[PDB]
RNA sequence: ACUGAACUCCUCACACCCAAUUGGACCAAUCUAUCACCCUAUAGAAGAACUAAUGUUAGUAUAAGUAACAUGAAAACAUUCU
């Protein structure tokens, strides 16, 4: 069953993380030094596998907890709920910085992530889904995409406007629950055993395992739903204020494998948009992405 | 700043002179610290000097009462019986032992003794201490105990009551010989640097950097 | 919280918002100049007892007037910028004494308006009004 | 005019507790990236403003001792110089004043 | 009632309002910076603007000389005015001064505002800087700008 | 200070009274509280409820197995009541089922036993025993005593009563006390059910009649937010039951409940229990 | 006062009427003293009537402290545990006898206002009144002014 | 006088078991004999009650008042107090629960009115009390919706019964 | 024909609805005499009982957080200006 398959993945993910923090020793300590233009000189005595940068920011001030989306660990981004495993340097960054591009790219992956969640959970339940991935696109794309393939009986049919509006209110319900992105570092042998059915996720994991020398891959869970991402993601779902799907298009090799790909646009709470400027961004996202 | 403020404030006084003198029961600090390794004639004189003040005094049985006083003095910290602890513990050893445990309880059980407690050295004071003398004994102790401190609201600060762990300490005792009612009481610890640090605390902390003004 | 549009954008993009939104207004107004090319409603001639819809104007000042007899008459000026129609009702959804239309004043900024009122104008096609 | 009945506590309590007499909470605060503390949007950073004010006072102290009294204001431009700097060809004609400190990054 | 009145009231009459204003910008010209209440400096802006605008005419204008002679009682900054400030904005036409609000005074809790001429010598204040262009919203707005440039 | 101490005395009684109401201590056994004699209390208790038999059987019933664990534990640092409670609850179940089925032959064995399990439950038996001072005589480890332990002691008293007096006197005891608590609550208050109309059609097929149809007889406030329907169940164009309700479904299931009461003979207007 | 005092609906302790009646007074705890002139009523009451009171009521249990007390007291708790103490200070033997008798008579529930002077467990026979009891039905089941 | 508020910190609860709900550590702190009227800062106490501390630091320090300087210095000195010697993990993940004010030891003087009459002038000193509790703050109870209105009224019509009858 | 009272009757208990004024039955708290001893008894004595005097003293509210009061301006806080 597709429902029992979902809890089957969530159980194994609980088996995997339980092995992680049970394997790591207890009462471990690490001295992480703060770096940045604001409040320098501080160093936090933190744990190795239960502490997180969000906990570090909460020791400092909740103003950063509300504004921090990622952190730089020795010159590379980091997920706010992923535990730092050694003494290092840390710096939180926000949307309004000199180079917030890595924060946008994480948001681009984040908003691209749970778009796949709501659409394949919304299905009209007898139909199946064989989703592929969340394709990476630059900031200038103007919209976040997500490829998908579907049965052949509804190949000619495309989702209508009321079907789009159904996904939007569902996505609005997901963010209202304030779902946090629970991440985990897993092995390729493990991740393939979670997605052993969907072939498109299988070869995607071998692709990531081939790119990685040690074949270790990171994984992010959206509540019951799970999916892979190339880069880090935003801490919470609630920080994306307005969020909706623009249009749908379908790519020439259709019959061997149909390439459907939805498209939307959104932005955070820290900079909310007005009705007028938001409207011209819709018809921008309704168009097709060339890539 | 005390003397300078007294000048500027104008609270002039003469030196406090009186026939009465403040009588102590323990010398502050120590006379000679045993530098432990990485793992004598003066001792026998100090041993037999204690015998000149109290002929009924032994050395072979001292490590027994030392460990006996150790476990019961710490059991008093659990019960929080300050009266018995004061007669069993010096006035220099009391604040460093009983200050930080305020606003919290403590649990300390004794499992066993791996090795027997052994005297390391014996030192002694001069006559120029308020017309009194004070002797000191050092004893190494290698045992296994449990420690679990709970704060005001009953959540463990660190340590678990079930697991014991090995520990090594060099306890320091001292006694007032001028009067006869003096008894051996814990004074201080050497806390050498080469020894390893204890278990960390499960909670995480920070430090505020230098508050830079404009 | 509560914020505005001009906060979170760059200085080089602010003129882009201004000229684009203004061109959108001019394009909407230019398209709705000729309602005859679109579909109009049935027209009927005036009859006794009938009425005619009024309008909204803009007073810009006063000035004098003179007649053939040389007599002076003070007279105001009333200017009409856009003044488009907004809604139609039946005398029976309204359930009133008489049917009703709605008329707008002058076009203003689309930024200082309400979302429910703004989307009402979008499906209507014209810019907002005072 | 004078009262006629003691105002009860329940009507006195209602008067001072009504929403307008209470102060209105404002969602109009954000973090200052420069100093790191908070600042109202239309207001400047109080910390960095005090940093600029006290430093400018020290520059005002410098030109004061150089001018040496009132009614000694010249009729030419002036440029501040810090340690590790020489006069440029542009400001060679402009007035210059010495100062013993390191160039702050916030200052151009 | 008051409708269309651009001027406002400062103190104990027309004698008072301009005279304390006169002492205010008189100190502004030498420091090129001043902190003061919001309403007071809000009036001084127009006075300072017209002051330097007629200062461009130069010391040869006997009219403007008598004006600046009245506006400034120290008599030392009037040569500094025509010789320094007028060349400073001989090319620049309007918007000479920058005005931003600052926190309230310590004791009376009155709103305050800072003034300073542009291109000053002393270090600037921490002005409120517009958000970076590298933000996603600015990039989205930068996106369709090429789309409209590509279409047209 | 003004002279006198009588006023100050009664004020201290008022102070400790307020200190009692503010921070009262936890309750304890009546044995811990003063003015208590163990042997005299069970004797006086036995005379209260009109029962007379050997104290060896009484003490064995009140004594639990848990107190013996603490008794020997404190002794280092006699007879349980399992047999008495076993025979007690055994006779009670057979006797309660006997009087209930003799009075209501139409009730099935399933539902009639669930009612017996309810009356012999924890909340009912302990409430009767709590209001009969059995808690004061029973002795256990923890206070307040658990309901299961108190339930075991109650049936243990029934067992000792059975061995001494007889079934007829034990029958009179459990009959009088327990049924009087049953007078208040109707059937479906303690014996909840699912698909009542489904159970109704099942019962009617056992009684060899046709499948009835639900029909609203009277209506009020249908479009109003307070709907009201009088649904009646007819078979062969003859009615059996009528039930009000909020909606048609609530009125239908209520009318199904109304028929089940009169079918099994548990109507509110039935013959009360004779004595 | 009714509004200042709590209230209750009338009810008995576990329906003591149908089955065997049980004296719902559990215990009496007398507090007398070997001295104190006020205790003459209680002590003479202990001599004569408390004996016969126990013979009359084998169910109830009695305790006597007989300790020094400036004022004699009598404490009485019932099966429900409701404790009720009354002062017998300077009272005659006849009053105490009537007082202990009514204590034996009453039950274990606090004396307060009663919402009503009776209580019925099955008040409804022939069906309680609803608005549609005393009006007829309509042919074909039709509301007024309805065609179909 | 009375100084129970300082004694409220001296209590010590017993040790808690492993398998039980984690208790939120409370902590008390106050300031004595401040120069500010009792009803004035009670407005400030009405503001801060029911939010987070760091969000509360923002409001009063921008609030153009004298009391805010007096009730902010008591706040963050309770913040660093709670972490140094009361075992509080996060200096920010906590919420104030009880913030009130009260009269203090006042001082009477005379104000000189016209025509020889005198007016007793009372100088006001006050005591300000604040309670902190760890964990996040509770959310505000939203207004009861129409469903709550409907069910409460139907429950009223279902709970009512005949009176003065059998 | 009904509604309809502190009238009347009914079950139980009854000294228990007049100003001023007159006669009676009790009694709070207190000291002493003598008992008593987690606070009481029998007698005597009295500075022997306060919802009220534009009452006395003290404390605190209402009016009210109202009426009313205040620092000429700038800055290096040296000086300058009105
Ligand atoms: N204003 C006022 N504060 C009180 C009162 N009772 C208690 N408090 C405050 O609460 C504190 C604790 O009192 P307890 O928890 O009752 C006191 O120290 C005091 O600050 C009261 O009647 N009025
Ligand atoms: Mg004025
Ligand atoms: Mg007064
Ligand atoms: Mg009568
Ligand atoms: Mg008269
Ligand atoms: Mg009396
Ligand atoms: Mg008197
Ligand atoms: Mg009085
Ligand atoms: Mg008067
Ligand atoms: Mg009057
Ligand atoms: Mg009076
Ligand atoms: Mg007024
Ligand atoms: Mg005024
Ligand atoms: Mg004045
Ligand atoms: Zn800053």
Residue D15 in any domain: the answer is: no
Residue F148 in any domain: the answer is: yes
Residue D41 in any domain: the answer is: yes
The kind and range of the H/E element at H102 are strand H94-103
Nearest to E120 by CA among E24, E37, E29: E29
Adjacent-strand bridge partners of B142: B168
Residue F153 in any domain: the answer is: yes
Contacts of G123 in chain H (CB under 8 A): 166
CA H128 to chain centre: 9
The kind and range of the H/E element at E20 are helix E14-31
Cα B118 from Cα B60, distance rounded (Å):
9
The kind and range of the H/E element at E137 are helix E136-151
Q: Which domain holds residue D87?
A: 27-108
Cα A95 from Cα C7, distance rounded (Å):
14
Cα-based angle B52, B56, B60 (whole degrees, multiple of 5): 105
CA F17 to chain centre: 36
Cα F43 from Cα F51, distance rounded (Å):
10
Cα-based angle A241, A244, A247 (whole degrees, multiple of 5): 155
DSSP type of residue A236: B
Q: For chain F, what is the radius of gyration of the CA atoms?
A: 27
- Please report, for residues B53, E35, E116, G74, the alpha-carbon distance to residue E31 in angstroms, rounded to integers and kept in the order given: 85, 11, 9, 95
Nearest to C28 by CA among C124, C130, C111: C124
Sort A96 into a burial class: Cβ within 10 Å, 0-12 / 13-18 / 19+: buried
Q: Which atom of ligand 1 has the smallest separation from the CA of H2?
A: 18
Write down the experimental method used for this entry: cryo-EM
C122 C-beta neighbours (distance < 10 Å), count: 15
Cα F15 from Cα A144, distance rounded (Å):
72
| Tokens 């050295």 belong to residue | B121
Same domain, F162 and F204: no
The region that residue B108 occupies, defined by phi over 0 for left and psi between -120 and 50 for alpha, beta otherwise, is beta
Q: How far is the CA of G88 from the C1' of I45 (A)?
A: 30
**Greatest distance between any 2 Cα atoms in chain H:** 77
Torsion over CA: G99, G104, G109, G113 (sign)? negative
Domain boundary among F159, F178, F194: F194
- Residue F67 φ/ψ, nearest 5 degrees: -65, -30
Which tokens go with E16?
A: 């008072």
Same domain, F71 and F110: yes
Q: Which domain holds residue F55?
A: 31-194
Cα D71 from Cα E79, distance rounded (Å):
12
Cα A244 from Cα G81, distance rounded (Å):
66
DSSP type of residue G141: S
Which tokens go with G119?
A: 């209580």
CA F99 to chain centre: 17
Rounded (10°) CA dihedral H50, H53, H56, H57 = 170
DSSP type of residue D45: P
**In contact, A229 and A109? CB cutoff 8 Å:** yes
Quick check: G141 contacting H, CB < 8 Å?
no
Q: How far is the CA of F180 from the C1' of I67 (A)?
A: 76
Give the residue, by CA position, lying nearest to ligand 1 atom 21. H102
3-state SS class at E53? helix
DSSP type of residue A50: S
D49 C-beta neighbours (distance < 10 Å), count: 21
Which tokens go with B72?
A: 């019961």
**In contact, H37 and H124? CB cutoff 8 Å:** yes
The kind and range of the H/E element at B163 are none
Give me ligand 1 centre to Cα H2, in Å.
9
Quick check: B204 contacting A, CB < 8 Å?
yes
Cis, bond preceding B81 (omega within 30 deg of 0): no
Which tokens go with A10?
A: 């969530």
Same domain, F206 and F173: no
Contacts of B153 in chain H (CB under 8 A): 13, 16, 23, 25-26, 87
Cα A64 from Cα A45, distance rounded (Å):
19
Which tokens go with A140?
A: 């200038």
Q: How far is the CA of F39 from the C1' of I57 (A)?
A: 67
What length is written for chain A? 291
**In contact, A250 and A258? CB cutoff 8 Å:** yes
Domain boundary among F194, F221, F237: F194
Name the percent of chain B in helix, strand, coil, to the closest 5.
25, 25, 50
Give the residue, by CA position, lying nearest to ligand 1 atom 13. H4
Same domain, F128 and F242: no
Cα A213 from Cα A188, distance rounded (Å):
11
CA E12 to chain centre: 25
- The answer for residues whose C-beta is within 8 angstroms of residue F24's C-beta and 6 or more apart is none
The kind and range of the H/E element at A262 are strand A260-268
Report the side by side order of strands in the sheet with G83-87: G61-64, G25-31, G73-78, G83-87
Buried b / exposed e over A224-255, threshold 16 CB at 10 Å, is: ebbbbbebbbbbbbbbbebbbbbbbeeeeeee
- Residue F14 φ/ψ, nearest 5 degrees: -75, -35
| Tokens 């029911």 belong to residue | H50
Residue F19 in any domain: the answer is: no
Cα A60 from Cα H83, distance rounded (Å):
13
Q: What are the sequence ranges of the domains in chain G?
A: 1-148
Cα G29 from Cα F66, distance rounded (Å):
31
Cα E16 from Cα G81, distance rounded (Å):
88
Cα F94 from Cα A170, distance rounded (Å):
58
Q: What is the CATH number of domain G1-148?
A: 3.40.30.10
E66 C-beta neighbours (distance < 10 Å), count: 10
Cα F93 from Cα F114, distance rounded (Å):
11
Q: Partners for C (CB, 8 Å, 3+ pairs)?
A: A, D, E
The count of domains in chain D is 1
Which tokens go with H28?
A: 């008390």
Nearest to F158 by CA among F62, F247, F232: F62
Same domain, F175 and F223: no
Quick check: H89 contacting E, CB < 8 Å?
no
Judge: C4–A279 Cβ closer than 8 Å, yes or no: no
Give me ligand 6 centre to Cα H83, in Å.
61
Sort H37 into a burial class: Cβ within 10 Å, 0-12 / 13-18 / 19+: middle
Judge: H47–D22 Cβ closer than 8 Å, yes or no: yes
Same domain, F164 and F241: no
Domains, chain E, ranges and CATH? 10-120 (3.90.1030.10)
Cα B148 from Cα B105, distance rounded (Å):
9
Nearest to A83 by CA among A171, A212, A186, A183: A183
The kind and range of the H/E element at G58 are none
Which tokens go with A60?
A: 């400092």
Same domain, F163 and F223: no
Judge: A45–B208 Cβ closer than 8 Å, yes or no: no
Adjacent-strand bridge partners of G8: G114
**Which nucleotide is closest, CA of G68 to its C1'?**
I37
Same domain, F54 and F83: yes
Nearest to A48 by CA among A70, A71, A24, A65: A24
Q: What is the full DSSP assignment across F110-157?
A: HHHHHHHHHHTSHHHHHHHHHTTTHHHH-B-SSSSPPHHHHHHHHHHH
Nearest to F266 by CA among F112, F94, F92: F112
- Residue A223 φ/ψ, nearest 5 degrees: 55, -110
- Residue F251 φ/ψ, nearest 5 degrees: -70, -35
- Please report, for residues C11, E25, E93, E96, the alpha-carbon distance to residue E58 in angstroms, rounded to integers and kept in the order given: 36, 19, 16, 18
**Which nucleotide is closest, CA of D65 to its C1'?**
I76
Domain boundary among F149, F165, F194: F194
Nearest to G97 by CA among G74, G115, G119, G65: G74
Which tokens go with B47?
A: 């041993």
Same domain, F241 and F218: yes
3-state SS class at F90? helix
Q: Which of residues 15-34 of G touch strand I (CB under 7 A)?
A: 33-34
Give the CA count within 13 Å in the CB-facing half-sphere of D106: 17
Q: What is the CATH number of domain H1-166?
A: 3.90.470.10
Which tokens go with D23?
A: 């102060």
Cα D95 from Cα A194, distance rounded (Å):
74
The minimum CA-CA distance between A270 and chain D, rounded to whole Å, is 10
β-strands C101-103, E34-37 pairing: unpaired
Nucleotides of I under 7 A from a protein CB: 29-31, 35-42, 59-63, 65, 71-82
G31 C-beta neighbours (distance < 10 Å), count: 20
- The answer for residues whose C-beta is within 8 angstroms of residue A174's C-beta and 6 or more apart is A114, A117, A118, A237
Torsion over CA: B56, B61, B66, B72 (sign)? negative
Q: Which atom of ligand 1 has the smallest separation from the CA of H5?
A: 18
């Amino acid at each position: 069953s597709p429902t029992e398959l979902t809890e089957m993945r969530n159980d194994l993910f609980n088996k995997e993380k339980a092995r992680q923090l049970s394997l790591t020793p207890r009462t471990e300590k690490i001295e992480v030094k703060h770096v940045g233009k604001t409040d320098p000189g501080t160093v936090f005595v933190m744990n190795k596998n239960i502490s997180t940068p969000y906990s570090c920011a909460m020791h400092l001030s909740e103003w950063y907890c509300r504004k921090s989306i990622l952190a730089l660990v020795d010159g590379q981004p980091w997920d706010m709920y992923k535990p730092l495993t050694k003494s290092c340097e840390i710096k939180f960054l926000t949307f309004k910085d000199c180079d917030p591009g890595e924060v946008n790219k994480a948001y681009w992956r984040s908003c691209a992530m749970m778009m796949g969640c709501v659409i394949e959970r919304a299905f009209k339940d007898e139909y199946m889904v064989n989703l592929v991935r969340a394709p990476e696109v630059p900031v200038i794309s103007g919209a976040f995409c997500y490829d998908v393939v579907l049965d052949s009986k509804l190949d000619e049919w495309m989702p209508t406007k009321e079907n789009l509006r159904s996904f939007t209110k569902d996505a609005h319900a997901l963010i209202y629950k304030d779902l946090p992105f629970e991440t985990l570092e897993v092995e390729a042998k493990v991740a393939l055993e979670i997605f052993q059915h969907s072939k498109y996720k299988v070869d995607f994991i071998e692709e990531k395992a081939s790119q990685n020398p040690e074949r270790i891959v990171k994984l992010h869970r959206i509540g019951d739903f799970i999916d892979v991402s190339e880069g880090p993601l935003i801490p919470r779902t609630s920080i994306c204020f307005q969020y909706e799907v623009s249009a749908v298009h379908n790519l020439q090799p259709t019959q061997p494998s149909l390439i459907r790909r939805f498209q939307g646009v959104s932005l955070p709470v820290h900079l909310r948009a007005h009705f007028t400027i938001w409207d011209k961004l819709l018809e921008r996202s309704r168009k097709m992405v060339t890539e | 700043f005390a003397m300078q403020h007294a000048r500027k404030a104008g609270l002039v006084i003469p030196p406090e002179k009186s026939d009465r003198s403040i009588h102590l029961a323990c010398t502050a600090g120590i006379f000679d610290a045993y530098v432990p390794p990485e793992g004598t004639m003066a001792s026998q004189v100090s041993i037999r000097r204690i015998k000149d003040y109290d002929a009924n005094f032994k050395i072979k049985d001292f490590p027994e009462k030392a460990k006996d006083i150790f476990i019961e003095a710490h059991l008093c910290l659990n019960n929080s019986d300050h009266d018995r602890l004061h007669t069993l513990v010096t006035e220099h050893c009391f604040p460093d032992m009983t200050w930080d445990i305020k606003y919290k309880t403590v649990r300390w059980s004794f499992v066993e003794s791996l090795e027997p407690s052994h005297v390391v050295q014996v030192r002694c004071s001069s006559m120029m201490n308020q017309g009194n003398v004070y002797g000191q004994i050092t004893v190494r102790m290698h045992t296994r105990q449990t420690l679990a401190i709970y704060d005001r609201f009953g959540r463990l600060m660190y340590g678990q009551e079930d697991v014991p762990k090995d520990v090594l300490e060099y306890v320091v005792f001292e006694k007032q010989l001028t009067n006869p009612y003096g008894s051996w009481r814990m004074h201080t610890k050497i806390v050498p640097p080469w020894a390893p640090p204890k278990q960390p605390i499960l909670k995480t902390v920070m430090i505020p950097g230098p508050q830079l003004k404009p | 919280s509560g914020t505005w549009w001009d906060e979170h954008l760059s200085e080089e993009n602010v003129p882009f918002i201004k000229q684009l939104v203004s061109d959108e207004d001019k394009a909407q107004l230019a398209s709705k100049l000729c309602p005859l090319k679109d579909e109009p409603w049935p027209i009927h001639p005036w009859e006794p007892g009938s009425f005619r819809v009024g309008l909204i104007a803009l007073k810009l000042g006063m000035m004098p007037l003179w007649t053939k007899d040389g007599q002076k008459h003070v007279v105001t000026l009333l200017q009409v910028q856009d003044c488009h129609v907004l809604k139609y009702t039946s005398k029976e959804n309204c359930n009133g004494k008489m049917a009703t239309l709605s008329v707008g004043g002058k076009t203003v900024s689309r930024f200082r308006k309400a979302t429910s009122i703004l989307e009402f104008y979008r499906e209507l096609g014209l810019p907002p009004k005072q | 005019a004078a009262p006629k009945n003691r105002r009860t506590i329940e009507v006195n309590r209602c008067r001072r507790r009504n929403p307008q007499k209470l102060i209105k909470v404002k969602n109009n605060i954000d973090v200052c990236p420069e100093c790191g503390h908070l600042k109202q949007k239309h207001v400047l950073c109080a910390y960095c403003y005090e940093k600029v004010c006290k430093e400018t006072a020290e520059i005002r102290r410098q030109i004061g001792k150089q001018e040496g009294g009132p009614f000694k204001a010249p009729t030419i431009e002036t440029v501040v110089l810090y340690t590790g700097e020489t006069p440029s060809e542009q400001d060679q004609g402009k007035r210059i004043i010495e100062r013993d400190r390191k160039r702050p990054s916030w200052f151009t | 009632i008051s409708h269309g009145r651009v001027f406002r009231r400062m103190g104990l009459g027309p004698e008072s309002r301009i005279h304390l204003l006169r002492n205010l910008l008189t100190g502004l010209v030498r420091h090129e910076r001043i902190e003061a209440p919001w309403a007071r400096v809000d009036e001084m802006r127009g006075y300072a603007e017209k002051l330097i605008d007629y200062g461009k005419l130069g010391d040869t204008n006997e009219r403007a000389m008598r004006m600046a002679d009245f506006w400034l009682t120290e008599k030392d900054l009037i040569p500094k005015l025509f010789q320094v400030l007028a060349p400073r904005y001989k090319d620049q036409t309007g918007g000479y001064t920058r005005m931003l609000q600052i926190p309230n005074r310590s004791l009376d809790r009155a709103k305050m505002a800072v003034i300073e001429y542009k291109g000053n010598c002393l270090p600037p204040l921490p002005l409120p800087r517009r958000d970076s262009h590298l933000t996603l919203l600015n990039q989205l707005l930068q996106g369709l700008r090429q789309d409209l440039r590509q279409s047209q | 200070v003004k002279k006198g101490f009588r006023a100050a005395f009664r004020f201290q009684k008022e102070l400790e009274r307020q200190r009692l109401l503010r921070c009262p201590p936890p309750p304890v056994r009546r044995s811990e509280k003063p003015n208590w004699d163990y042997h005299a209390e069970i004797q006086a208790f036995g005379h209260r409820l009109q029962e007379n038999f050997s104290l060896d059987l009484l003490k064995t019933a009140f004594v639990n197995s848990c107190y013996i664990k603490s008794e020997e534990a404190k002794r280092q640092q006699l007879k349980s009541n399992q047999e008495l409670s076993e025979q007690g609850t055994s006779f009670s179940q057979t006797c309660l089922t006997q009087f209930l089925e003799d009075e209501y032959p139409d009730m099935p064995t399933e539902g009639i036993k669930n009612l017996v399990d309810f009356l012999t439950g924890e909340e009912v038996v302990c409430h009767v025993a709590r209001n009969l001072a059995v808690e004061q005589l029973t002795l256990s480890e923890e206070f307040p005593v658990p309901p299961a332990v108190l339930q075991q002691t109650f049936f243990a008293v029934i067992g000792a009563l059975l061995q001494s007096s007889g079934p007829e006197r034990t029958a009179l005891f459990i009959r009088d006390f327990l049924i009087t608590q049953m007078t208040g609550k109707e059937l479906f208050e303690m014996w909840k059910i699912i698909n009542p109309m489904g159970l109704l059609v099942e019962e009617l097929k056992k009684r060899n009649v046709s499948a009835p149809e639900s029909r609203l007889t009277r209506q009020s406030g249908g479009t109003t937010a307070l709907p009201l329907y009088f649904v009646g169940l007819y078979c062969d164009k003859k009615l059996i039951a009528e039930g009000p309700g909020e909606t048609v479904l609530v009125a239908e299931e209520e009318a199904a409940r109304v028929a089940l009461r009169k079918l099994y003979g548990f109507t509110e207007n039935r013959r009360p229990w004779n004595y | 006062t009714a509004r200042g005092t709590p209230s209750r609906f009338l009810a008995s302790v576990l329906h003591n009427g149908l089955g065997r009646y049980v004296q719902q007074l559990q215990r009496l705890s007398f507090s007398v003293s070997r001295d104190g002139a006020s205790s003459r009523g209680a002590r003479e009451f202990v001599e004569r009537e408390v004996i016969d009171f126990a013979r009359r009521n084998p169910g109830v249990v009695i305790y006597v402290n007989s300790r020094p007390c400036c004022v004699p007291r009598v404490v009485a708790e019932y099966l429900n545990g409701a404790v009720r103490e009354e002062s017998i200070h300077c009272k005659s033997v006849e009053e105490i006898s009537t007082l202990v008798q009514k204590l034996a008579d009453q039950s274990g529930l606090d004396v307060i206002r009663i919402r009503k002077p009776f209580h019925t467990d099955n008040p409804s026979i022939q069906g309680q009144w609803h608005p549609f009891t005393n009006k007829p039905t309509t042919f074909r089941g039709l509301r007024p002014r309805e065609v179909q | 006088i009375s100084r129970k508020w300082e004694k409220k910190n001296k209590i010590v609860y017993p040790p808690q078991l492993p398998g039980e709900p984690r208790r939120p550590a409370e902590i008390y702190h106050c300031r004595r004999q401040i120069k500010y009227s009792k009803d004035k800062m009670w407005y400030l106490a009405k503001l801060i009650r029911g939010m987070s501390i760091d969000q509360a630091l923002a409001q009063l320090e921008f609030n153009d008042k004298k009391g805010a300087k007096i009730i902010k210095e008591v706040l963050l000195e309770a913040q660093d107090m709670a972490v140094r010697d009361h075992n509080v993990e996060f200096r920010s993940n906590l919420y104030i629960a009880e913030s009130t004010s009260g009269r203090g030891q006042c001082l009477k003087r005379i104000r000189y009115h016209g025509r020889g009459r005198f007016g007793i002038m009372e100088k006001v000193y006050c005591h300000y009390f604040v309670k902190l509790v760890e964990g996040p703050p509770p959310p505000p109870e939203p207004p009861k919706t129409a469903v709550a209105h409907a069910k409460e009224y139907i429950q009223q019509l279902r709970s009512r019964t005949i009176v003065h009858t059998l």
